[model samples]
Target: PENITNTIRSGHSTCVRFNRKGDFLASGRVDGTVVIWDLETMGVARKLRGHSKNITSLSWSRCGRYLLSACQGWKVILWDLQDGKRYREVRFRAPVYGAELHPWNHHQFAAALFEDQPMLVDITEPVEVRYVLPSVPKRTSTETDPALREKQAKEDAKHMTTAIVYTASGDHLLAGTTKGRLNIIDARTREIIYSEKIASGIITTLRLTESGRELLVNAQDRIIRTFIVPNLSAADDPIQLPLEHKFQDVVNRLSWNHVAFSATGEYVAASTYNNHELYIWERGHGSLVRMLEGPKEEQGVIEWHPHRALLAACGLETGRINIWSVT
Candidate 1:
């Protein structure tokens, strides 16, 4: 048995992501720098510097040819993996929290900006804003008075898009708001297919299974809820899965948590936002399989390797990453 360690003394690491092939790992730091590491050699392959502020998120294209990184400076920089150079820059009016590439298309991506409209970006020859999602309407009953509805509209404007992701088919986008509302939009028509309130606090993370048949929602409520989305092409009603897991400690409002399913969809893993523990559950039975020990401080994110079933990675607030291979 052996342990690998890579130190980052400049600043604390905020986010990390594995490439599609699981050969390389990318990490974003609060110092506005991104480092790409070769997992086989445990060596730094490239250091990317473009964001002027803290990097919030990172995602890789389906083809592994492009990498998208979002920062608190209202910038989303796209990097070409072939040459390790910044290929494109998309600016927003507000700080961007999360960005993800399309699951099937390598040239398209979506960004979630704070208190602004989420936008669809095209990285092709004629680079431009492909689509801008409309604001989510307030959830009010028709029998409600107009004055109360107006007040609710004003309150809804305060919530921002906290997280976003594309379905497996790349035909739809799922966005979560700071007010704990979830909205599903059609990529082609930009229409809101379904909208619902799922939590009492901000929705910190959103994830989908490999087949897009299920969605895992994590919020500041310290609960991870799973829902079954049987159809992506139509706006059919989604059934909530029986599994509802809650953490023991309160989640930190400033930190972000993540949930992801294994590549084979046999297990689901989640990180506690403010606790030093990671939970793994069996998908078929919705039972807790293991509670793994994490870093000394809060856990930031957890990701399952794309190609390995038992291999996973977890990022901690201490700027250390734990790679585990479980039996």
Candidate 2:
């Protein structure tokens, strides 16, 4: 494990993901290009292009045989990693805010439109939409409780699109909105099981750690908070912990590597923002572990390999990927 080697260069790199096996790295560029690099040889092997606008996000299939690209032009393209060929593309009627692959079902993926509707796509059948989930609940009249009704009313006002399924079981899904409320949904029943408010700012990202016992949420208020996940069948009030570290600047992206989890469920990893340096923090005591400041000032994304403690990666605003070793 060593410091990252910046190889391929392109437009401002927005997002990146490594293949499941860590053999190849795929990066989405602002110029609407998704480039694949062979990690073994540390070289750019292929480039796929077609989207007319900047590419915001990209993900590799579970098997690492395909690369999915999401661009600002309202198009999501799936490319075959083996042949470096474009296989499928879907265009939305409205601009999309976020797109992600289903954690359990690699063939099924979902995208959220600016209007707050999530469109589910079957990669095997690009044109077929398995189902569409609405962002806001249908307005109705019922007297549950004045306080409960007030909370629901407030949640209805904030439109959210970021949805994620628990890794341990696809039974539960979490959606964070601009209103700072997190709505938990039952995957089987597709019903709102529980809804809770965490912060006053937009909930930027959501992540479930290795065991799925805790939920880690990052918000626009520059806070990364953790909460315990109750019974999978019932929604219970989460145990909210104090903010681990308050950033001088806003925090952008966060990731959890299962490798860092100790026997007691403690873990550690890096978080980056506009300031350009990455800070690593331990979970239990909420203490700062290590800080790495690279030569580049644009750390866009940071990810840890699921099974390897010594290996981690980060992306720069200048469109460079940095791979680092902890030990």
Candidate 3:
């Protein structure tokens, strides 16, 4: 399938994810709608609606039986793939910024919020919030002026939890904030294993390599940093991979981008925050392998197919998705 084309109109999709089997693609739109499209037929199989606000993120269960959609509203909905119906709705105390399913466990997931701690939810019979990760403490200011103190407080309020993902073994959680901080938590113990500031702006997206040995961090500053995943039980420190690549394209300050590793983890694919360009880079060589161009709008999401080496997809602000295959 080494061909490129715009497959369908999906209402300005904000997030896109492929199932484990690589048979279907699920997308969440700015209109608060979620659509599942069959790759073979190039047609929409299901259109789901519930949230009244724009969708923030979308994830599929390990088995590909359930699809999770988060919105700017106060809830995350889980849709049953077989029946094309909502399986459960997990409500939060604030607007959900992101949600991700465990890589191994199907019934459990984590969700990030704007004003509270990230939550761990279980979709068992009666859906329930299993736990809430500890909130990151606000940075204290030493400024003696009252007006400056108020300004600092307001800036701190804008820092929200924006990303969350479970480690490969499902034993730990990695969360990111709008203030460019990343926190690694021991999921079973509810203790933070590692926490540090990563960038100057929001940490827009985070992804783990297929082997779970490295983490890819995409920030609003147009920088991508890779870090080694340390064994939580060990005393060693996590180190960043020597390759730190930055995109030179001018991007919107408020827009977000995505990063994904190839199935074999040899190449990294990324979308520009505010342009219709996608870049691929070789991991160890730190070389820009290819630059793919599509519609002239902001690229919202980019994902590589699980089973196809040259197949990848990028969602655009024109409500269309571009599927590209490298020759």
Candidate 4:
């Protein structure tokens, strides 16, 4: 009836990520430490101590050789896993909400800043950081009313990116905003090329499938919407973008803490804000497929392994990572 095979206890882990290879796991802790757990031995391989505040996010390069982590105290560090504990660190003016490394290019990354326009950061030879300014489109219409534009500017401010994920093709990055705008950014031009206007709440999480064909948007409106990413060569009509099935507990009315897609993109899983069980839905049928109930406290983040049926989730209160796999 249950399949929790491993309970990883290292202390108050905030977020958990399995590298693309699935052999190494990265867990960001509340103590500002990131523990690199070697899956084969099932033990801590390295403890990276570079942040002085709570760790907010962790992303592994596709090669699984480098890890990028972000913290609430305005620092992001890149760890090299080849040998000794050498890391590259940087401080920002605002707390980073999320940080993701380029799938193939470890020298560049996208940082979702707190209440600020998201940035595309580059690492150079001398080790200084270059902030490639990326911004949402300004009000380009002919609303000449100065009063309307002032409040409009404030509204646009709230639309600053809250989450950022690079497309699998590495040509574009999707930026989700606090005010329900999912804008697409050109990786090379640094422009908001297109976007979705149907999203009505804060886009809390943006998870793209391994093939980059679909997206799962978790927002504050208590709904999870699926979207089929159109052809990169397709139209500019915001209304033309297809918004797929909207999954929600209409009767119980639950807000999800985190959402993810299965490796094959056939299932969408989410951890609720107050429930102790994880709800999974079959993507094609738009129906609840299974509920993985557990005895521990509720979870904060649930991440599906990039290439396996295994699922990893971290307890919100216990700080332990629970590993669920096939029996």
Top lDDT: which candidate number?
Answer: 4
- The clash numbers for all candidates, in the given order, read 0, 1, 1, 0
* Per-residue lDDT of 27 in model 3: 81
lDDT of 1 by residue, 229-301 (tens): 6466655553323334443334443233677778776777877666666677876877877777744666666
> What TM-score would each prediction reach against the true structure?
0.84, 0.78, 0.84, 0.93
lDDT (Cα, tens digit) per residue for candidate 2, span 204-285? 6666665677666767765666677767644544323334433222343433211123223455444555555666666767
* Stretches of candidate 3 exceeding 4 Å from the true structure: 1-3, 137-159, 233-256, 310-316
Candidate 2, run of 10 with poorest lDDT? 255-264
lDDT by residue (203-299, candidate 4, tens digit) is: 8899888888888999999999899887773444333447888899989999999998987888888999988888889889899888888765898
What Cα-based lDDT does every candidate model obtain? 0.75, 0.62, 0.76, 0.83
Off by over 4 Å in 2: 1-11, 137-139, 142-157, 163-166, 233-272, 310-317
Q: How high is the lDDT of residue 223 in model 1?
A: 72
The local distance difference test score of model 2 is 0.62
Error of 4 at 284 (Å): 2.2
